[model samples]
Target: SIRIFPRIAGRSYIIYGQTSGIICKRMEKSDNEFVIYNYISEHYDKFLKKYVPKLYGKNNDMLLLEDLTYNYNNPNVMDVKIGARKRKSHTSGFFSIRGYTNSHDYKFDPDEYLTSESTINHIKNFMEAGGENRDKTKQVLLKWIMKLSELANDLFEINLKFDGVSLIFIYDDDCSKCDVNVVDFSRVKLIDTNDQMTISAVTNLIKILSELADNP
Candidate 1:
């Protein structure tokens, strides 16, 4: 069955997925998204697994993306906007938003709208951990710190920039299975002219996850 997949944070108000195993996003008439996606697929697969989502190619009006959620038993999906184009953070740092989903009940009521010192609690809540002593909750955050770092460092050597990118997170509540990827290339481009905005995002997100990983 086809349905609206509502894992907010960067809601397009229209993207959707189906039981048949693919998510599809329709494109505006004036964008090079299809080409950008294929370019990334051709070149950046080495950057990270699913970093750009698996591009299943596209037609004239819609792009098909691999359903990152399909492979997980309990996909707790999250999307953290990276590289504050002034759509940025809190606690005197960088990074953006708490847009995630919890499979158990499935709803995301946004708070703070940007990462902050309060982020740790937001994350704990996202993992759906309360009085349950969830160590894997902390474990996934630590794992992504490396995940994000690895992507950013690889991106550094490229002649590109991410204007409105996000890091997508998919993991089970147990943290036994997890995957992270760089998403939203709607504004990404190749530019040998300047350093990547990914540098700023990486530096801050690394700190954000590092502090959260150390939390008890």
Candidate 2:
């Protein structure tokens, strides 16, 4: 749902495009069930800047989003998705690294690398930095996931771009300055009550990050 360009307005911007027609049929709910979901869709950026990226601007369906890749010289970026289903009712959720981009160009090529191995190794090395930097990285990552859980509890429908296509990570050396941005919200839905989808997603994320921390 996004096309990355090396330069836009003297920097980098991800062009948010139309979707691929894939739908999470199981998440389909009545519009009346999405009170908190609608609110967050409008106010999430204002309240949750740490985890959410800054929206540069938008024109119809195409949006200009700040490219996190600009934050580093040679960044190792990863896109991880959670709480997704197969078909409509498939259970047993999982987290996956879509791929990684090494520089500001931000072109994600899945065939070029190993998914989980590269991700875990990168995170492991990042945590091994061992100091205020490492601590801050861990703090930001945990806080972001925790905030997602809080938003879910508040009845917000949390649809993240974890489909191994849109979401990404950007950083140099280690994750001490890692910049993770969740993108492509075109298909996000709002719900009227607290749902298990988001809660379960947050749980899985915490487990992964915790493993990274403990191993480091």
Candidate 3:
């Protein structure tokens, strides 16, 4: 199953290298699910102009982005960071550094920093213990890791290239726990290896994307 990332009242990005597509669009709140709209509004054009300069829209919802395969960097690593960003400035009317700014709206988890392997492993370890059911959660975690590994390998084979790695952040509104699958796109291999890993990865990816309300 293909992997996807979803968030609340924000945007999700999907990269389809086979079709040379980049699915990046804002998601608006609706009933129970997010209405996934293609890039068709004026804001869509603005988004291309600002964030991805080489990208252009075929229609309002679809876009053609410059392929970065040849120029793809080696030893690439990718991850996701979730946080809020500052939108509006605030005014307390008193400041040590005056006239600099009135106010600011801060965004959380703006960027995913690239770091050493040790640090990356450290994060994995940290997340592992955040849950209470030690044995059950560990088993679940191992399975998710395997799924990410397979996804990574598959992405690399199909595209003949890679874009670092992808860490899919999955959230269920009914629960406080959030799940993530950090896929290393260069390492997936399909086998009769039906372990808990394959099950969790495939299941979660399909379930989340399928349940999403398609934006019209």
Highest-TM-score candidate: 1
Error of 1 at 65 (Å): 0.6
- Global CA lDDT of candidate 2, please? 0.44
Candidate 3, overall lDDT? 0.30
Candidates in order, TM-scores: namely 0.80, 0.53, 0.29
Pairs with steric clashes in candidate 2:
33-191, 33-192, 34-191, 34-192, 77-169
Tell me the whole-model lDDT of each prediction, alpha carbons only: 0.64, 0.44, 0.30
lDDT of each residue in 1-216, candidate 2, tens digit only: 444443212112333233321111112223221333344557664434655455444444334345566556555555554434334321223444444443224443333343556555644543343345656666656655565455445434444322221335455555445555444433454444444654555566666666654556
**CA RMSD per model (angstroms):** 3.6, 9.2, 19.1
lDDT of 1 at 24: 82
User: Candidate 2: lDDT of 12?
Assistant: 20
TM-score of 1: 0.80
Lowest summed lDDT across 10 adjacent residues in model 1 is found at: 83-92
Off by over 4 Å in 3: 1-59, 62-130, 160-165, 171-216
lDDT of 1 by residue, 9-76 (tens): 66553356543567787777445667677676676657535366776757567677777777777677
